[PDB]
Amino acid sequence: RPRFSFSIAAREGKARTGTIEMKRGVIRTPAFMPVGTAATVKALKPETVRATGADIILGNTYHLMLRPGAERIAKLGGLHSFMGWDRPILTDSGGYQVMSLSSLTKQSEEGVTFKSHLDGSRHMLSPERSIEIQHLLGSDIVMAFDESTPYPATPSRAASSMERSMRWAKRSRDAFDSRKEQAENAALFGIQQGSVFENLRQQSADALAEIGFDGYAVGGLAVGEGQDEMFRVLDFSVPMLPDDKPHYLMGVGKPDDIVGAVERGIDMFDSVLPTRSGRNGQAFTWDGPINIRNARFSEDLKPLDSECHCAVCQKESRAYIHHLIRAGQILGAMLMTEHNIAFYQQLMQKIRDSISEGRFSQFAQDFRARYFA
Amino acid sequence: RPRFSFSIAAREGKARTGTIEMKRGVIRTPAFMPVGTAATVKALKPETVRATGADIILGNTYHLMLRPGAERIAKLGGLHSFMGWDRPILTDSGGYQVMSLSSLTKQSEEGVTFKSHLDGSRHMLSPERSIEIQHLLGSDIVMAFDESTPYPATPSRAASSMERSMRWAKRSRDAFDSRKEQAENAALFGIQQGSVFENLRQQSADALAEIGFDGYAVGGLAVGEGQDEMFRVLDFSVPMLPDDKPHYLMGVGKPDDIVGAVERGIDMFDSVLPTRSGRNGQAFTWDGPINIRNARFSEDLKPLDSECHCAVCQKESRAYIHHLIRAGQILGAMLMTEHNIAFYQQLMQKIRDSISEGRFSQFAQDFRARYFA
Ligand SMILES: [Cl-]
Ligand SMILES: [Cl-]
Ligand SMILES: [Cl-]
Ligand SMILES: [Cl-]
Ligand SMILES: [Zn+2]
Ligand SMILES: [Zn+2]
């Protein structure tokens, strides 16, 4: 296989379906990428994650740089060998989780220094160090290091952070290219910033296209703005990105947000929602989410979802899973998580099939009517 | 298959190997029965437990009567259907965990009343109610309800509790026999008591044989007496039991205790040790137990054990499992538990094979030399 080849097989309005071919495997798009390094609640073997239909998983640079450490992972043969997943891995840059999880931070044009939320040890990230860490992990899709823009943001702060992010995108590009092994075997995605401002989104897209990336993420969304606003921003933002490269919506999200984002040209998604939901008792179904802890499920012998093809729905009852989750059993979290991740993959498959067949608009309508009935 | 048929295929000294045929399947003896209802740390699907080699699992009446409740389980089709295990299940009587886990207790000749350690709700167990609950669960091997003897015990208290236990054994026998569906489809085991006193052990064995049971447990051991004393008690106690029925050592235990107990005529074992050990970081190996949390394993790419045939040892490194357990990940507990349960099954298989081949004495010697090297 090639290092990277994105091919669009079919289109419907702004929606696209196709494939990304990489050395470690093919990724079907639109794609959902489950998190493979979720704190505390990692509950599935790699074979199980693959069985749900996932083509690629996401690794968190921030968590991995703290435990077990990036240099250690490299010594042990890289992240694929370490965790036992041989297909593509996308790594985030670490920047977002520094801002959201670390205890103290000092930000500058060079990068950020921070204290671990685990033991208060001191660490550093910069465009160069982030790219280096993602190299040590051996990830297949590397994210450029950017500076987060909180929500809401003033026009001035949105502009400043977008501008810094574009300077950092060039630094990321150069760091990636200067490492032969990484440049020849991995891909690099840039991240569009600009908050809710169309002019800043345009400047960011133009800067990123001038530098040139293998894919383009829409950053700065799913940070509390609400679906209406997120959709409004996607409406103008996605068409600014190169049409012939994948479009990645970071941190999204809920099933309806995914459907609407595909309607607006997005090809790739990640979110902790399905994995985190599991242990907390939330199961996704075609008739909307349910909370399995609710007493109404205590004697319900039906599967979590009536149509779901997953191994959990083939074998396990709502009543048993209700009991396991109530009783604080590890197995309850395992079953909920396997189902939720599988549900998301079945959603993506239905999206892909409907675009290929020219009936995605109808699917989106039918999906919403039932999911929110 | 028959309701119950124990057949001894080979012997070596006091050790025996054979099979128990029951309606739901065959159990190879000597057998280890993993707990299927362990509080909080249940971390394996039934298919995985079966894959380790387990022929039968143990269910805890005390836990199940509190959550989800015995009547509820019966309404949902019985414990096999509820939890998804279609092979034999042995249930304990509930009596031991009442004494060890419940907050307040009132004991009498009729039984025991107690408060749940979960919510202080009031509950009751008696020979009749225990047998009824085990019927509602639908277990295949039902344990008679007895009265626990703490360690150490005075001769008078050991005698009193043994005598009450024998009265309760007759009540258990009669309750079991009076329930047609249970009597025709399940088996009933009696429990020998008498603490460390040979004369009381003899009286207990005689009383149990007069009543007649499908199998005989040696109760009152593994309660803090130490291996030397446990072995001394087994030396005289096991030969008092009917030779042609299975001998079950409740709550044992460590690998060397299991080997020594087989040398003394024991056919069946249960212990939470392998399952509890997992999340706490203890892995059993042929070279003795290790604690995977130890820093020495952080870069160790070898499997937990060099010869273990389990799926964990085929795929996973010590370094990864070390990381998962340190990081508090559910998957770490899953992997440790699968390996430990599989290790125990491989131990039992080696014991069975060695008895069949007349080389169990040699196996026991070789096992100990390596395990304690
Ligand atoms: Cl602001
Ligand atoms: Cl419950
Ligand atoms: Cl006493
Ligand atoms: Cl670690
Ligand atoms: Zn499902
Ligand atoms: Zn193993």
From Swiss-Prot, chains A, B:
Gene3D superfamilies assigned: Queuine tRNA-ribosyltransferase-like
Signal peptide: none
GO cellular component, one term: cytosol
Entry keywords, A to Z: Glycosyltransferase, Metal-binding, Queuosine biosynthesis, Transferase, tRNA processing, Zinc
EC nos: 2.4.2.29
Active site per database record: 92, 270
Record keyword Zinc present: yes
Result for mutant: residue 146 to A: Abolishes catalytic activity
Pathway(s) annotated for this protein in UniProt: tRNA modification; tRNA-queuosine biosynthesis
Subunit relationships: Homodimer. Within each dimer, one monomer is responsible for RNA recognition and catalysis, while the other monomer binds to the replacement base PreQ1.
Identification of the protein by name: Queuine tRNA-ribosyltransferase
Species whose genome carries this gene: Zymomonas mobilis subsp. mobilis (strain ATCC 31821 / ZM4 / CP4)
